[PDB]
Amino acid sequence: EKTVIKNEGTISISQLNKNVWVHTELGSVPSNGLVLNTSKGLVLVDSSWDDKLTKELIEMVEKKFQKRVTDVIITHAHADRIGGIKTLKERGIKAHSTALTAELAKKNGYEEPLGDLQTVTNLKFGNMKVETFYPGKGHTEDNIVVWLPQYNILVGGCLVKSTSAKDLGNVADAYVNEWSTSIENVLKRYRNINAVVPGHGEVGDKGLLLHTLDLLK
Ligand SMILES: [Fe+3]
Ligand SMILES: [O-]
16 A cells, blocks of 8 residues: 555645655645655656645655755646746746746746746656656647656646546636547557556546547547
8 A cells, every 4th residue: 555645634645656656735626746756856747726735745745755846847837737836936946847838827927937848858857757748739738748767657637537537627728629639649659658647536547548538539
């Protein structure tokens, strides 16, 4: 049984392996990201719904792992992903994103992440390798996935629905005729996957990608 650690339960971290944890927060609706415990600091995939939760998440992981959060990867311009950007910027935490995500964050009144990520970007933090991939439009115009090639773990983000999701959710900003193609692009790039972390809900495997394809029918 994987180690699970909670705050007083609006924030929980669940261990996938020695250096990779899933962070999950409740907005007053749960949301997931990753905590990467690297030799050079903590790296998050996604912030949280707001600054209060983002501050608490950072404080929890810095205390536990005894290192600072240095970098966050923002996977699209929605509140569950980017809500804590003010906190990141004022703490000197680097907030990586594609240019489009940064363009949309600005449009919508949020402080801007770096806009440094391309269609494929390879990053390394200590020994931890991270690839970001923009597969095309889906849940939003800008959604990216994050791949950890040393573990074959995919962070699907909101592009990927959990087994418990029985519909597509908020499609206000979605591209329902391209989302399937974008999922296929992920499946084509990553042919051998070990875990898939959805934006919301339980961790799964490639079956979550197939589930999302079925929801798009
Ligand atoms: Fe979203
Ligand atoms: O979202």
